[PDB]
Every structure is written in C-alpha cells, then in structure tokens.
Design a protein around this ligand. Sequence first.
Ligand SMILES: Cc1cc(C)cc(Oc2c(CSCc3ccco3)c(C)[nH]c(=O)c2I)c1
Ligand SMILES: OC[C@H]1O[C@@](CO)(O[C@H]2O[C@H](CO)[C@@H](O)[C@H](O)[C@H]2O)[C@@H](O)[C@@H]1O
Ligand SMILES: OC[C@H]1O[C@@](CO)(O[C@H]2O[C@H](CO)[C@@H](O)[C@H](O)[C@H]2O)[C@@H](O)[C@@H]1O
Ligand SMILES: [Mn+2]
Lengths: 426, 552
Amino acid sequence: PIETVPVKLKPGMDGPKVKQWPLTEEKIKALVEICTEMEKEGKISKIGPENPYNTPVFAIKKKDSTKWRKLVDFRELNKRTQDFWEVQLGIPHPAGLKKKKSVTVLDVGDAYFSVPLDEDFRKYTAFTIPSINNETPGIRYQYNVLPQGWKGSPAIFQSSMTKILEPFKKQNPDIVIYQYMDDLYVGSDLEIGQHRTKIEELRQHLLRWGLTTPDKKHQKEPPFLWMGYELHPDKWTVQPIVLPEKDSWTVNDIQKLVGKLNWASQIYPGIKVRQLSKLLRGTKALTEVIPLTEEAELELAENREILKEPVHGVYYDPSKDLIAEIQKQGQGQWTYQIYQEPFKNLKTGKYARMRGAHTNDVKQLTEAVQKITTESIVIWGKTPKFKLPIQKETWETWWTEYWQATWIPEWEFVNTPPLVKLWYQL
Amino acid sequence: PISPIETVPVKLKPGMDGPKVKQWPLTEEKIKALVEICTEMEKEGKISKIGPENPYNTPVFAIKKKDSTKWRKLVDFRELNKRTQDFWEVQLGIPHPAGLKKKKSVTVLDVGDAYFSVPLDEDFRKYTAFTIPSINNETPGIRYQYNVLPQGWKGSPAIFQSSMTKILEPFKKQNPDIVIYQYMDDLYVGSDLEIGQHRTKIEELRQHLLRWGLTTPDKKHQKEPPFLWMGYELHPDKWTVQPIVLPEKDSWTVNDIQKLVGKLNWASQIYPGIKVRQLSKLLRGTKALTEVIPLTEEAELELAENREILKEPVHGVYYDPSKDLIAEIQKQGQGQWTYQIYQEPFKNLKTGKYARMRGAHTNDVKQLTEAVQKITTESIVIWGKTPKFKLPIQKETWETWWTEYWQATWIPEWEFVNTPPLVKLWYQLEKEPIVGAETFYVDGAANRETKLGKAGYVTNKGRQKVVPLTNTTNQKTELQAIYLALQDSGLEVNIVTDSQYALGIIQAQPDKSESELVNQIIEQLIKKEKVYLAWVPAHKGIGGNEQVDKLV
Ligand SMILES: Cc1cc(C)cc(Oc2c(CSCc3ccco3)c(C)[nH]c(=O)c2I)c1
Ligand SMILES: OC[C@H]1O[C@@](CO)(O[C@H]2O[C@H](CO)[C@@H](O)[C@H](O)[C@H]2O)[C@@H](O)[C@@H]1O
Ligand SMILES: OC[C@H]1O[C@@](CO)(O[C@H]2O[C@H](CO)[C@@H](O)[C@H](O)[C@H]2O)[C@@H](O)[C@@H]1O
Ligand SMILES: [Mn+2]
C-alpha cells in the first residue's frame, strides 16, 4: 500500500514553468551522478514531453566533504501549492526559542524520501539537468516522493514527526523543538556539554526509532559555530544608532551630526536638534572648529540616551512579510534592518568577517543573507524578502558558489542610497 | 515511416473538446489532388478513413508545391492547437559554433517524412479528423483521421524530438565516442575515426534508424562541407557567419533600421569592432514599422565604419577543452566595449560587444565590470566554464573603486593588459573637508508650472551669486548650482548642497553622462585639485544653507 496524501495547487493556478539556468560542466556532471542514483533508488523518474512544467535545480557543497548536493528552487512551486495547506493552525512558531542558550539545527530532510508523493501531483515537481551549449535536450525528471525543499513535504510528514518526537519530548520537557521546512531547531538552557549530549540523544532516537537520518555534523575545527549548527540566540546583539564622541567639533562635524539626528527623528520622536543647530548660525568654513555650547550636550548627550533603547510601538504582524535591507559598509562589515513598514524596524544588526583568507563581496553577502534568515526563522517563524545591494546578474551567477542552506528566500535587487552613513558604526 | 515506437499520451486542455471547423468546398482539381494524396497516405498507414461516427473537423486545403507536378495537402490545425495541452518546450536555443569541438569527419543526416514516421497517441487521433469535400455539393465527402504526427499540430516537434532521443539512446551508449547533435529533422554525426571506419558507423546508424522507421540520405549523406547552417558556415576547422549584406538606402524606415541592427549584431559574433549604438539610438522612438526615419550624422558615420569592417572576411575557430579560455576586453569609445575569447594567440573562438549603460550616468570601471559579467554568462552557456580575463585596468584602479563602492561586485581571476586606452578614475572626491578652501553653500529652485529657475551660492568668504535659468526643473537647478560653485572656485573647494539627488549623482563618481549638464560638471571636477562635497537637511536652520535658500 502506497498511502499518498492528496495534494492540489492553489485554486485557479497552474504548475510552475521556470527556466533552468545554464550550469558549469562541473555542476552538470555532479547533478547527472546524483540523479542517476536517485533514479536507481526510485526517488525520481524520467519524464516525457507531455509534461510542460519546470523548476530550477542547482548543485552546491555543504561546505566541502568534496561531496556535491542537489538544491531544487521550489520557491515558485511553494507559492502555488501552499499558502494553504493547513498553513495557520497546527504548531506555529514557539516564542522561547530565541531566548535559549543553545539552539541546534538538524537536517531531517532525508526522512521525506521514504514517503511516496501523490500521483497526480508529481508532474508539478519536474526539473531539467541542462546540457552544455544546447548540444542535447536536458535530462527531465519528476519526483516520486516528497522532495526536500517543497513546502508540502514537512506538512505531509508532520504527523509522523510529532509521533517520533513524542517519547523524547515526554522525557525532556524543558527542550523546545521547533520545525521549519527541512530542519529541526532544538533549544535548551543546559550547559554546552549537557545540551550537546542531549542533542546526541535526539539524533540516535531519530536514527533508531525513526529509521530517519540526521547527519552528524561533529564539533568545531575553526573557532566558532560547528556541531549540527550551534546558535546561541540569548547572545544576539542589536546594532543601535551611535553618535560620534568628540574631541574638537568642526562645522562639518555638526552638520553631519544634525543630518543624522534629523534622519533619526523619523524613528525616535524625542530627538531634538535645536540647541545643536544654533552653533552653525552664519555661513562658515567647514573646517572652523567650534566649542559645543552648554545646552548642546544637554541636548546631544540627551540624544545618545534615547538612541540606546530600541524604539517601541513596533509589533510583528504575521499577515505581512518581513523585509531585510542590507548595506555594504566596507572592511568586511555589513549592516541590516528587518522590518515590515518603513521606519519600524523589528531588528537591526551587523555581520562581519574580513581577514580570514578567502572572502569577497558575494561570499560575504551570501553568508550575511543566510545569517539573517536563520535569526529571522528563530525569532519569527518565517524567512524575509531581501533587498540585495548587488547586481542581479552577478548574484545569479555566483550565489550558489557559497550557498549551504536547504531553503532559498525571496530577493530583489536594489541600489543603496548614501544612508549607509546613518547606519554605520565605529 | 511505420515506427514501432511507443506513443506519447496527449490531452486537450481541461474542459475543452475537439475542434469542429467546417470545411468549405473548393476546386474540382484541388479536391482531386487531395483524394490522390490521401489515398497514397492511407496505403502508408499515415491516416485512416473514419466512420460516420463523430470526429470533429479541421479545414483542409491544397497547394501548388514550388514545382508543379506535385501538389501539397495542408491542414490548418490552428483550432486544434488551441485546444491542445502544453508540451515541454522544444529547445528554443541553438548550439553556438565556437562551442563545438574539433572533429576529423562530420556527416549530416536528414530524416525523411520526419513527423509522418512517428505514431500518434491512439486516443487523440479522433481530434485530427478532416474531410475532403465531394464531387460538388452532392456526396458527403470523405472523412480521415491522422495516425501519425500531423505536419502542423502543436505537439509534433516535441514528440518527434523525444522519440528521436529514445531511438538514439542505445546507439549512443554503444559508441561513447561518436557525438550526435539533434536539431529538428537533422542529425549531425561527428567522430575522430578513420574516414573508412567513420563511413562504417554512419551506415550502421542508418540501418538502426531505418529499423525504427526513420529514413536517412542515400549517398549516405547529401552532406557537402561547408555546411550552411542557421546563418552560419561551418568548415572542418573554422566557422564564420554567412555572407552579410548591408543595403544602401535614401529613405530608411523603422523597419529598414531594425533589420540593419539585427544583421549588424549577428556580424558582431566574429567581426571585431562592429558598433550599433547610434543606429539603435535612432530607432525605437515609436513603433511604426514604416515611419521613415532621417539618418543621423553619427548613425551614418557609424554605418560607414561597419561597412569597412565587413569588407575583409573573418573566421572563428573551434573549441579545445584541453587548452583554457581567455577573454580580453578593450574600451572603444563612449560606453562601447568589444571583446574576444580565445585559446591560442591569433585564433578567435568568437567576439562580441557590450554597449549598455544601465543608467543615466556611469563610469568605465562599473561598465567594465558589467561587460565581464555578460561574458562570464556567455562563457558558461557556450563552454560550461568561465574564462581567464585580460583587462585594460590595473589592480590598484579596480581595487580602489570597489573598496569604496556601496555595491557588491566580483570578478573571476584577471590579468592587467597594458594596452591603452587603460580604464581609470578621472577624479576622486575628498573624504574630508579642505582647510584653506572657500566653502560654497549652493542651492537651486524652480517653478513647477513656469519651469523658470534660479541657481546660486553664498560662501564664507562673503561672495554671493544668483543665475537665472529657463525651462528647467528643481533637480536640474540643483545640479546647476553645483556647476556654478565649481566654476567660481579655485583649484580646491568645499561644496555644501541640500540635494540628495545631486549628491547621489556626483558621489557615484561618473565619467560620462546622458546629461549635458552632468558632463560639464564632470569636466570641472577633473580640472579641480581637491573637491569635498557635502549634504545638509534643507530648511533646518543650518547657517550657510538658510542664507542661500532664501536667495534662490
Ligand atoms: C550542421 C552542423 C551543426 C552543428 C552544431 C555541428 C556540426 O558538426 C560538427 C562540427 C562542425 S560541422 C563542419 C565540419 C566538421 C568537420 C568537417 O566539417 C564540429 C566542429 N564539431 C562537432 O562535434 C560536430 I557533430 C554540423
Ligand atoms: O533570481 C531572480 C530570478 O529568479 C526567478 C526564477 O528564475 O524567480 C525566483 O526569484 C524571485 C525573486 O526572489 C521569486 O519571486 C520567485 O518566486 C523565484 O522563482 C525569476 O523570476 C527572477 O527574475
Ligand atoms: O595572445 C594574444 C595576443 O596576440 C594578439 C596579436 O599580437 O592578438 C591576435 O589574436 C586575437 C585572437 O586570437 C585577435 O583578436 C587579435 O586581433 C590578433 O592580433 C594580441 O592582441 C594579444 O595580446
Ligand atoms: Mn535646495
């Protein structure tokens, strides 16, 4: 018996017909291998010309076992198969998760491969391994089982997940377990050693009683976040707006300051530039040094005060989507703001790695995006839409060179205005 | 033509039904031509007389072939095509010559009756019914239905292709050596075997195709190198574009032009230096295919250069996977770049151009980086890898421009080619205010209805100035006030504006613009020794700024 769950597309919607991006011979050879095996294993099947649908496929590395892995871009299919499964009242995203000392992320995507996919729905999961220089028509396939990356996979497996995790949760009542797509987020306030030990009990539990398989990302090699994918949200900073501390102020310094403070006024109501502007009265050389008045600091220092405590009257609305803007700050540094309505930041932040050996803007941006998305998932339960400060073509050419996640957010390309100044640091 | 290949299942779109288009009777001879054609087809299995039951109908017609003893049946499935399900779209792209690899011998095989050789899904036949009218308004007329892929149906191209692929699958596996390209009803077979052994395999392939209902050419090939293929001419060791011919006209129409550019862009693949900026600039204004267009001085000066280049023939070479890919780019003139990709000195795989500004204002570095991107994408498509770049820019130049640039860019490994004109930054703005430099507070304003304006400045040294402007905009006066300050200052100047717009343009350090005013500002910036540009919130009591705001 093949107990497949009936699935359908959103009303009045047709399957996705997205074009395959041209791929390097290297990535093509990898895909051919991976698919030849999945086929032999019954996970996918070759299809004929009567199937007109298509979803983009990519080849990435989960950071180097020198293994390759297929990454299907089901962003389009997800939007037509599901913002309606039972997408709003099962187990939504838990709130204590972002307060835990440790949250470990484990990939349970391999479970799905056991469950057969609904017959009438398969057609919609078709993809194409491209050919070089159009020499031959691409190799076409469709799925016979729940695919990793499709948003219906976790939903259909849900019942089975909650069933396997039951015993484990029944004995560890102080461990929050939140699932998002192909991943499980396990958080606790234990000590690193206990926390890690406890994750290991979970792995082995899935393995033996799931006969499900979570990969063993053994612990750290380089100094920071390596075992499963070990986060520590209770230690997540906020990058507040900072106003320079001054020795000697020049007309030009105060002008810049007044501009930044003025801009800030659209967020912090208490900010005032009255006693600060008075020092500019007259048309002076930008160099001219000027002593801060007595009422100045009584205003300036008062501003630094307001600009410390993130604003309020900002609540997360689940019907609206999150938007993340990132700005290149130079020196391997990057700032970002997650929001839903302009000038209502739910969060602000920074990301930086400049002088290991190997890094470039695209790689940096690529990691920043995955970092923001993960924090985003942990804090709100969804991935945001990114406004990337890079050129469409460039991003499309290289993002898969450093992508490691199993999910892919929405993104658009923008041209940052000189407000990087109003967000930069030190 | 009797293929035993399993059929591909077909369906009409959801809810729709077969087509019921009435046949409007015709000529005495035309009906007779059909009956004779269809009787011969019936004998061959291609079609079958259907019962009085119910097949729908599609209009039939018959034409004089471009030879007069034989006529041609012709079905207009337009209606069936509309009710038929979508299929996986057949290869819209085409293999590019510079991507093919060197082959000792290449044979071209034409499949005959391609479509009529592949069976049609049994259940779908009924919708292909048609009827040849009667003696003349008397007898009912004969009803026929297709049993094979009809010459004008929607699913024929894709189903044929897929069937061909399946038929070739076993052969290509018993000959990992032979390479076969499928394109429509043609098959290009190549190999690095001895002419006698090659001719051997070809005959094999042929017999294989034949045992699957596919007939190939008799002299084993009506293949005579060089092959004229899709606007290309392929020789055993080189390739070129087919004879390019530019028409000389007195009155050019929108249509005349578009056709010119199109041909020019096609020459661009292998003829270095082709340009089409001006001829194109002069094009899409509006879309009259027939609205005569007056040839611009530049457009004719450009067309002239193109003619000269096309005078001497050029050729491209084939790909050698062993050797690697190299791309070289050289600046031309005014947002125009040309490039060539090669493996060996003096042997081009292909060439190309990049003339896209991506904005009102830009600079060489940013355009150079984009050209690199277009080439990279093309290289991946044609060869499956990225080439090593040789660019007219030194590491310092590019290094500087991006550490400062607010956007994220990237370039595969590259090498500096010292062969002017070299790409460079013509001016850099100070990152801090100058000390013994007069500070200019500038402002511009315009009437949104009268479109009259003002531009001026007030400096710390006590100088003031205002200049009247006509038919202008708020944003335009803002740039003009800056231009004004630059004109009245020394080799070093501090400028303060309240215009984010003018800030954004200049802070982007452009060396060329579609704006006349911006190019003048740029000329001034180059003259200057040190320029520091600053911004302040308008109408906020900033001394300097308030005084000048009231002035203008
Ligand atoms: C009409 C045509 C189109 C294409 C896309 C390839 C082809 O034959 C080829 C050719 C070129 S065809 C001309 C030729 C090759 C040798 C002698 O004459 C090359 C270089 N390499 C190959 O692998 C094959 I197959 C023939
Ligand atoms: O990368 C941009 C490019 O990707 C496509 C698919 O080829 O669309 C994807 O990315 C969009 C922006 O994030 C999504 O809206 C869409 O869901 C996803 O398929 C192109 O449409 C787009 O130009
Ligand atoms: O290594 C390439 C080197 O050779 C030159 C001539 O000295 O270029 C030749 O070959 C190119 C393509 O193979 C042609 O586009 C070029 O016109 C031809 O002179 C140098 O230009 C180049 O540095
Ligand atoms: Mn102004």
